[model samples]
Target: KVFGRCELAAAMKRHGLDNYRGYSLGNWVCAAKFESNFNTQATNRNTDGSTDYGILQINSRWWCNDGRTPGSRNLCNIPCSALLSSDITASVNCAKKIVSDGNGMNAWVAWRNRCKGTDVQAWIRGCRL
Candidate 1:
């Protein structure tokens, strides 16, 4: 809930994420913009009763437990609420684990559907890395 586009990019860079697991920072920036518009408190309920968590919109079905949501796989082993904070350390950690799972940014449906093959260079154009 506390980042502009450039701020988010700077944070990612500071966290050693200019590039991680072969994906570019632009991809991550673009994904954040699309998935949650940099709102850490963002939540989107899926039709299947699952919810997407944090800036990356990670799924409750296979990522974190919302407590109220039954059958969450909680793959990241963190509470769903942890991702909903302005301090993105935990969220970034979980996102890195997600990318390393071989899906890359494809793990985010918004990235696959909106950021893929699009002109995402604008995401980092003025960030200076």
Candidate 2:
């Protein structure tokens, strides 16, 4: 599903992204804005051969077992296909695991470049929490 901004925020909040591991809901909103534009089916392949999947674009290199990225750790222990599903539950849990692992929200370079060190409040402004 391609979600609207607030719709995405509400979903993430329900899944506990809000303030999870010290990052606020606004930060997650901003990261999703740049990473997948709130599309559940988003995917992007890097030149180095890793592919990012789902709304958060969890990477195959470290998080998912795509069975294609050589030596992938599959730390999330989930099939990459799970990330593309509109269900979103698995990806959300996997994302939490990523943050809990100490990579921080910067694990997604889009978040690092676009959301980090910024006023993410705008992303959740005018929306009911």
Candidate 3:
């Protein structure tokens, strides 16, 4: 599923992504905008043979198992396909772990390149909730 900016904001809010571990909803929204354009089925194959999956683009190298990534860590203990689901609960949970245990929002290149050091609130303009 593809989500509009406000729609994605609402979903992330429901997941407590707003200020969860010091990353605000705007940060999450900004990252999603650059990462997958809010499409849940988004995937990108890295040059290293790993793949990024779902809206947050959780990786196959360390987060989820796709059976194609050699010796994938499967740290999330879930199939890569689960990240593509529109429900987003799996994606949210995985992303939270990414922040909670992983390296925080810097785990994503898009977040570093596009969403950081600028006006991230632009991602949530006009969204009351």
Candidate 4:
């Protein structure tokens, strides 16, 4: 369901990412599966009218705060929602960056190592890759 470099470049340029470094197509797919179960229309409330959206479940309501107003010219660049609505390749590319670099699974690796938790192995097992 992911397109890798063959698809993600455009979005990466738009979002100012270098490239899909450190993450493969499988990594993108796994990130989506772990984050939103691949649900592009998913939204979770945070005691406010804000909402999360799309496959990345970006929490646009929280992450952007009206930055993505239903349909905007920059819709393709709206943090998490972009992962769902923008070009699939770009979305996947961005997804990998987030997971590999920001607030995502890779960071968990260090955390788990610090705490001597089984997080990395658990992640590898879950992805089955």
Candidate 5:
């Protein structure tokens, strides 16, 4: 489902990710917009046949198991479908682990390509925090 930016910001802040790993909430929000447009159930199949899962579009290669996929590192210890839930708790936790793994926001090409060095205040311009 596509979510409002303010709603997403509130959820992110509630999850202690307003500035996780030194990356701003705007970065996360922007990445979400570009990656999956805030749709929790979003999934994209890459050219390599691996799939991207959830709101962050986390790749199957390193994070979660999609059942049909093999050789997944499963670093997040969660099934890929877990990331597709509307609750988003699992996705947020997995993203935290990703940032902590030294990839930071770089783990998401959307952030590096679009949000980085861009004015992201618009992502949460009307959110009352």
Candidate 6:
């Protein structure tokens, strides 16, 4: 619980879809807990054998062009670690796009419940945390 504030801040500032910060922090905490278990170093290897890295789990191959240079493309200009550096505003904005795309927190919540619901704090209690 010691890292709750910083963690919550990272989640809300970066991954919140709605501007309303009422339960936004909790929502993002839920999202992050669901996504990678707070692993800032988390990475996902794609079916194509590509790697997504860092806190927000950025796929540099897509966003950074494999690190050719900075600002090469604006496909979500900022990476996960950059967003996680502060409050994750960019990631939250991206999450807004994702939510608008149809699959939203519901998917995250469902997945979390399935994968890690036993830990109440990681589930519905995120709103209270």
Whole-model Cα lDDT of every candidate shown, in order: 0.86, 0.90, 0.92, 0.43, 0.87, 0.47
**Highest lDDT against the true fold, candidate:** 3
Provide TM-scores for the models.
0.92, 0.95, 0.96, 0.40, 0.95, 0.50
When 1 and 3 are scored with TM-score, the better candidate is 3
Which ten-residue region of model 6 has the weakest summed lDDT? 15-24
lDDT of 6: 0.47
Cα lDDT tens digits, model 1, 47-119, are 9999998988888888888876777688889999999989988788889888888878888888999998988
**True-structure RMSD, every candidate:** 1.3, 1.0, 0.9, 8.1, 1.0, 5.9
User: Candidate 3 has which clashing residue pairs, if any?
Assistant: none
> Measured by TM-score, how close is model 1 to the native structure?
0.92
Which stretch of 10 consecutive residues in model 5 shows the poorest summed lDDT?
65-74
lDDT (Cα, tens digit) per residue for candidate 6, span 1-129 = 222535555445444432432334445555566555655556675555444544344455445234543344436666445534434455556555444545544434434454433433334343432
Model 1: ten consecutive residues of lowest lDDT? 15-24
Please say which candidate is ahead in TM-score: 4 or 5.
5
Ranking by TM-score: 3, 2, 5, 1, 6, 4
How accurate locally is residue 51 in candidate 1, as Cα lDDT from 0 to 100? 91
Best by TM-score: 3
**C-alpha lDDT of residue 127 in model 4:** 31
Better of 1 and 4 by TM-score: 1
* Candidate 1 Cα errors over 4 Å, as ranges: none
Residue 55 in candidate 4, Cα distance off native in Å: 0.8
* Model 5: per-residue Cα lDDT at residue 120: 80
- The residue-by-residue lDDT of candidate 2 on 23-100, one tens digit each, is 999998898889899998999998879899999989999999888898778988999999989888999999999989
On a 0 to 100 scale, what is the lDDT of residue 78 in model 4?
Answer: 48
Model 2 local distance difference test score = 0.90
